[PDB]
Design a protein around this ligand. Structure first.
Ligand code: 87K
Length: 133
């Protein structure tokens, strides 16, 4: 069910990521470096455990989870959140909750590209990744 998401993905387009980071309270210097990084996202499965790595010259992260089971997460910007990832409409939907706040990280495949939509507050960001062979 998640299998077309698996693999190594490289960032090839970003829209409104500064808006998203600023909504989350990320400081200007961090937003500045993040606006020029191009992460690699690696999505691997082992049985029903998924591991999602995000690698860059600035910040690395890694999470492991089962679909539909809440997990603790510490984000790249150091928020301690309660997370859950599920498949919804063929999209991989990651919801983070903290301090009564929420943000969603939604991944959808369109013409072989992975489109990540990041929503917090009113800010909506769309990032596009292409597979690596
Ligand atoms: C988990 C993302 C880590 C790699 C980040 C790229 C280099 C620096 C960015 C981190 C800056 C703090 C803002 C983080 C906000 C939260 C996660 C955004 C992930 C975006 C993506 O996966 O394309």
């Amino acid at each position: 069910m998640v299998d077309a998401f698996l693999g190594t993905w490289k960032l090839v387009d970003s829209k409104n990521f500064d808006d998203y980071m600023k909504s989350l309270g990320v400081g200007f210097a961090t937003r500045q470096v993040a606006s020029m990084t191009k992460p690699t996202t690696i999505i691997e499965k082992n049985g029903d455990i998924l591991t999602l790595k995000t690698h860059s010259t600035f910040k690395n992260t890694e999470i492991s989870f089962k679909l539909g089971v809440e997990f603790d997460e510490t984000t790249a910007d150091d928020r301690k959140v309660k997370s859950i990832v599920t498949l919804d409409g063929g999209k991989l939907v990651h919801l983070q909750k903290w301090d009564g706040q929420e943000t969603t990280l939604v991944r959808e495949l369109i013409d072989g590209k992975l489109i990540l939509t990041l929503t917090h507050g009113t800010a909506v960001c769309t990032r596009t990744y292409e597979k690596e062979a």
